[PDB]
Design a protein around this ligand. Structure first.
Ligand code: CU
Ligand code: CU
Lengths: 274, 383, 383
């Protein structure tokens, strides 16, 4: 219903070759999924996992700025790989889905079932709408620079509105011992973190140069701007990550870079197959 | 559980805890509990430990087996960390509620901004019941009753499931056809003309419209359901320290030594009772460890954990210092409790120094506390 | 003009200005003017605002319509910023001279090193005359009279014109002949042999000699015309704070709430008059805004701007606190002035806290000032 038979006919694959290709896909794609889970999860948690773990770290200054900048990195590289090599537009969504799968597994088994923290206190939460819109921008524009601009803007801007339905109810006010707190703050105080005291929270604190009514908005744009840079940089990193050569040697013992080329991609190879 | 690893000189000369009460010993789930105490910030604050300009009073629980209902330093709610003064005494009270059954060692700690955790004494508390019977009913300022254990649980899971389903559909609409090798061959031999599908364009447009509409709709629904919300609270807590109590006892440390192949702390001091009533020393406290004699045993909490109490406090002259008299005393704190808490580890410290609280009592029962510190010399008994 | 944007909790608990006099109201160009006042640094200094270890007293003018002849904190010339103490009171006097005619709102500000600007109250001052009649005659230590408006004006313009003429000649000696395309073709086809001109070498040598000679000559001429010069002054200013006045009134804040859909500040306090004469509260001051009652109206500057004065201070018991009596009072500061200065914006603050100055008077007219602060709770009248 898509155009798969035409693609297979253009590739000149006999039925056994088609079955072998299907087996290659079924073997390699789960491997890529697991690698994305592991590596992207490590990168995200060790760069932005602290705001990710706890409800009271989700603030208006650092969370919506740090999170998208860290998240765009693997997404840009994987999108480069998929789009450039196979014309597949689901890179960023796949990255964020893998990250969320790993995050949910660790929160349920590590934080909750081992450390006895409640599940609602460790919602990560989502970063998916921005990745989806970035994928849609890359597919519709087909240009990676226009994709950098527009998709990075979307990725940096849609983070806070997309997470507001999850963490908005946690901002309801409570009064404890005559002191006003957000419900996330009282959840953080209620469930003791022996290794995490209050003063380590890198959250907003207000300033005499600060417009309290615009804070998130400013954080929504700065995180966007850097994203437009970061994407671009990591897009070039994708070209570094796709570098596939061999160190061959001969005679004097000299080492030369050698590239294995696809024979089907040559000038007259497809016509001579028949 | 780890406090002994902490270098002695540091803990010994940082926070000097005293009068710590844990109770009740055995409590059922959903019942109230309290940890109360006082602590003195030693004047000989080590250079390694930073000044307590941002101090948070924490609980050293095995896990959140207790929900910290409140923490109050002196009388000020200590939800936000704040500065504390060195050489001043403070009182703390932690109100908790039983969550997870079991036997658990429950400590006092003072987390300092750059110094780190300063753990305190510990006692075993028992919770009897079931974790599935735990309820923590709270009331919000907007006028809604909630349960802290189950709050905003279905909302987050629901939004996660919705967005993850959308993402899974987007991913799997492409993982249903030849995806790696035939596409690579076609692209490397014929370009991307056959690799672009109008049906994929229609799906992309529909999904982009759906994503933007869902973001806007969720934001508007949340802002209509909860019109009033407060941001994440921050700032600092501030409380005046306990007033300095008049001390008729003045102590000057002249010598101090500790056995390297042994367990003993020998301190030579010059004490002056410039008051008007005889005064007798009865207790030396450091790192929660207490060395007591008959005088100290006379005024002793019968419910304090006995694993941190050692009757090993000896003086050369165990007589009451008469008013207006200066006396040279030699105190000897010797018991196996020094080996458990590793007084032995002062030989590898970059600062060989001791500190603690020496407690004395009047004939009428009034208590005086002196924070004593000095340099300790190693004594090699093996030689 | 911008102070209302500044978060309330911050300004409310930083600098508490009081007794501010602007005058004369209408002054001609080249005449003297003065802004005097006092300010208290609140003990509840917010964590967001850094400590005033480098404080400069500035003037919030629309433009330099006034030339700041001098600024003196207490009695020390405050040309260089310096440290100020929290919990202490200071007096300031700014002497200015009229420069630009018009109507201008003239403020007091205290710029703190890392906190930023802390703007104060403002009043409208009028200047009548002409900006072209402005003269500021000063006398230098070397013994020369100058005008600050026209000083070192012809010298800088002259040297700029000379060097810019030399640079323009150097540039334009080459922008008079084929310069981009023929040179590129000749260089890319034949090398640079035909692109080097001996006349250009002669011009280059002459101009280099002229440039070096001009640099040396200008330096020597300036060092011969002004043998004595001082560098750019730096350092810090230092003045002792005003002595702490004895206060017979001690106030402890127990509760405080503010209406979110409204305008009101309700503060519950426990007041103690440990003096020997009845004391009656009359004024609550914060962020320059003043709430007064009959007692406060009795002692009121008739020339203070009326746009920051609100007769809305109400007590449950408006009776004088007798000596040696502790009383529970509930103060209610309600007026539209809360909406103008945005007391409303405490709901989006990461620290919901109020602060201000409560003023009280004796039967004989002596004034006591108390800096009060606490946590404010939002009250949702819409519910
Ligand atoms: Cu323990
Ligand atoms: Cu103004």
């Amino acid at each position: 219903i898509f155009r798969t038979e035409e693609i297979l006919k253009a590739a000149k694959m006999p039925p056994e070759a088609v079955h072998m290709s299907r087996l290659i896909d079924a073997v390699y794609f789960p491997i890529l999924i697991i690698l994305l889970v592991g590596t992207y999860h490590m990168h995200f948690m060790l760069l932005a996992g602290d705001w990710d773990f706890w409800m009271d770290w989700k603030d208006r200054q650092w969370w919506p700025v740090v999170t998208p900048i860290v998240g765009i990195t693997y997404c840009s590289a994987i999108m480069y790989y998929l789009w450039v090599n196979y014309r597949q537009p689901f890179g960023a969504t796949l990255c964020v889905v893998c990250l969320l799968i790993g995050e949910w597994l660790t929160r349920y088994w590590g934080f909750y079932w081992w450390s006895h923290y409640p599940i609602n206190f460790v919602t990560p939460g989502i970063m998916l709408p921005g990745a989806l819109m970035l994928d849609f921008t890359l597919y519709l524009t087909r240009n990676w620079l226009v994709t950098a601009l527009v998709g990075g803007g979307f990725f940096g801007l849609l983070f806070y509105p997309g997470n507001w339905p999850i963490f908005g109810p946690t901002h309801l006010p409570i009064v404890v011992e005559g002191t006003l707190l957000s419900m996330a703050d009282y959840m953080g105080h209620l469930y003791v973190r022996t290794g995490t005291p209050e003063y380590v929270r890198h959250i907003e604190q207000g300033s005499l140069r600060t417009f309290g009514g615009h804070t998130t908005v400013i954080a929504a744009f700065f995180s966007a701007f850097v994203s437009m840079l970061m994407f671009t940089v990591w897009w070039y990193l994708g070209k570094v990550y796709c570098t596939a050569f061999f160190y061959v040697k001969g005679k004097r013992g000299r080492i030369v870079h050698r590239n294995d080329v696809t024979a089907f991609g040559e000038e007259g190879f497809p016509e001579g197959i028949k | 559980h780890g406090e002994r690893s902490q270098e002695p000189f540091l803990r010994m000369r940082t926070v000097q805890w005293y009068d710590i009460k844990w109770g009740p010993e055995v409590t059922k789930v959903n019942e109230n509990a309290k940890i109360t105490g006082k602590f003195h910030l030693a004047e000989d604050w080590p250079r390694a430990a930073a000044q307590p300009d941002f101090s948070f009073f924490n609980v050293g629980s095995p896990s959140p087996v207790f929900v910290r209902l409140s923490t109050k330093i002196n009388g000020h709610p200590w939800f936000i960390s704040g500065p504390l003064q060195i050489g001043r005494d403070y009182e703390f009270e932690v109100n908790l509620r039983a969550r997870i059954p079991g036997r658990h060692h429950m400590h006092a700690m003072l987390n300092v901004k750059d110094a780190g955790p300063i753990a305190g004494p510990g006692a075993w508390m028992n919770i009897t019941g079931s974790w599935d019977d735990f309820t923590n009913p709270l009331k919000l300022l907007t006028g809604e009753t909630i349960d802290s254990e189950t709050f905003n649980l279905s909302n987050g899971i629901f939004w996660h499931v919705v967005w993850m389903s959308i993402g899974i559909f987007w991913i799997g609409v492409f993982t249903a056809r030849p995806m790696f090798l035939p596409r690579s061959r076609v692209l490397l031999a014929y370009g991307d003309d056959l690799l672009m599908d109008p049906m994929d364009k229609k799906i992309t447009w529909v999904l982009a419209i759906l994503t933007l509409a869902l973001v806007w709709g969720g934001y508007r629904y949340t802002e209509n359901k909860h019109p009033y919300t407060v941001p994440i609270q921050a700032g600092q807590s501030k409380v005046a320290a306990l007033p300095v109590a008049p001390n008729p006892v003045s102590i000057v440390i002249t010598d101090a030594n500790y056995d390297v192949p042994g367990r003993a702390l020998r301190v030579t001091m010059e004490v002056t009772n410039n008051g008007d009533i005889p005064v007798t020393f009865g207790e030396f406290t450091t790192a929660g460890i207490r060395f007591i004699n008959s005088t100290g045993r006379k005024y002793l909490d019968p419910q304090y954990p006995r694993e941190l109490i050692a009757v090993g406090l000896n003086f050369d002259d165990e007589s009451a210092i008469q008013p207006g008299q200066t006396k040279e005393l030699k105190m000897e704190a010797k018991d196996a409790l020094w080996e458990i808490q590793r007084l032995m580890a002062l030989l590898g410290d970059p600062e060989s120094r001791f500190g603690g609280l020496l407690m004395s009592w009047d004939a009428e029962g009034n208590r005086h506390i002196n924070s004593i510190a000095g340099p300790v010399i190693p004594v090699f008994t093996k030689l």
